Amino acid sequence: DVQALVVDNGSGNVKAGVAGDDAPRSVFPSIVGRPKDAFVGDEAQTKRGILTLKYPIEHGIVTNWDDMEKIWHHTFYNELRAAPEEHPVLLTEAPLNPKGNRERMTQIMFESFNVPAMYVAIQAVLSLYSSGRTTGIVLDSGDGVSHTVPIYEGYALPHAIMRLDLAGRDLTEYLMKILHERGYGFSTSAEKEIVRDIKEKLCYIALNFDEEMKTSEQSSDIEKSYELPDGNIITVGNERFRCPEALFQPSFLGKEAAGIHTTTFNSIKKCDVDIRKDLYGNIVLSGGTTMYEGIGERLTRDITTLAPSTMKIKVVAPPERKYSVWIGGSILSSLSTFQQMWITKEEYDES
């Protein structure tokens, strides 16, 4: 008689809550502040003036285990008010996370937090399940990393996962950069949060970039306002679509990386010919950086161009895809079979 906790370990935000909910009840920044013992999440940003702030998760991989343990403690004790030693826990991990990292997270859960049972899930796989599919390719673009993850009959294909060399934080930083054209000087950590919100509220993806540059220059209809915290209004023009264009043209960031269309194509090509149709027909978007208006239409055009013309390209953009990893975890950990999937503390300790 017990309810699992579901924790999606994001580079930018942790999503946490209870199995069987349709959305995480706790979403907070993946930040730990220590004096210049430790503060986490929104409180750390509120006290940035007296704290040094660090991100324990880098491109989806935990790289500061002591600070990550502070994040998990905050999750259980200050967000959920749950005894970790009394609930099963489902924890997410990035595609291609090294087994040594999983083992270190498992050790912390079973020996620091004394969790009684746990299950580790690949983020992209959970998102596929949340879309009602067992086969497809997930493009999961978050704050710190983007992956393309082919999945066949329930399971990722490890040899075909690829990384697109940018994510939402790069897009925030690029908007900060290009707004200097208009005279804006956003640069501090606090200002970066403002610009992240501008990006989310005003950006969009052009269906055809060159044609959008030409139409936006013919009038002011591109321009939109945003009210800053101090009450001043900022106007943003073609930056609205030039910012997320970097997902398709990473050279805008000075990166040689392939864009997200090319990366998706390359990832499908790694898979044997006989399953590619099912992947092209089930391209599923997840994560906050896939939320731009226009993304599905643009991706469809660009992947259709690259792919063999016998293929049928269907890009799926679920409305609640910003939380689809967490939602998939909530579903999985609710199933009548979940109790058979986890590892118990007794098993681990005797292994």
Partner: protein, 122 residues
């Protein structure tokens, strides 16, 4: 250990389960071929081959008004059943009104739909 897994694929025939509150629940045989548009289902067709061996096709059927817990669970239970069957089942996603001819062909009266369904688990 799930009781329905223990019954799955033991004889030639057709087995239909409905996702109900995060569980697989047998569909009453009288209802086979009628599907609630508000629900998701898992279907296992077992065929006896010439050699005597068994062939498995797993289909998960998604009603136009089913909730995300139901469609997600149907997909996951499909994977788990296939694993139970040692990966031998071919998996098929079936969307209301766009089902494969193979799936339609399991029902001599053809596929029919009904309003409503079991309540979401969410």
């Amino acid at each position: 250990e799930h009781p329905e897994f223990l019954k799955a694929g033991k004889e030639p025939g057709l087995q239909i389960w409905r996702v109900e509150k995060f569980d697989l629940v047998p569909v009453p045989p009288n209802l086979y071929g009628d599907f609630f548009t508000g629900d998701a289902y898992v279907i296992l067709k077992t065929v006896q081959l010439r050699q005597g061996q068994l062939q498995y096709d797993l289909h998960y059927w998604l009603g136009n008004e089913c909730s995300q817990d139901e469609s997600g669970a149907a997909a996951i239970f499909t994977v788990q059943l296939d694993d139970y069957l040692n990966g031998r089942a071919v998996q098929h996603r079936e969307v209301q009104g766009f089902e494969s001819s193979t799936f339609s062909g399991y029902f001599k009266s053809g596929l029919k739909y009904k309003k409503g369904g079991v309540a979401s688990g969410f």
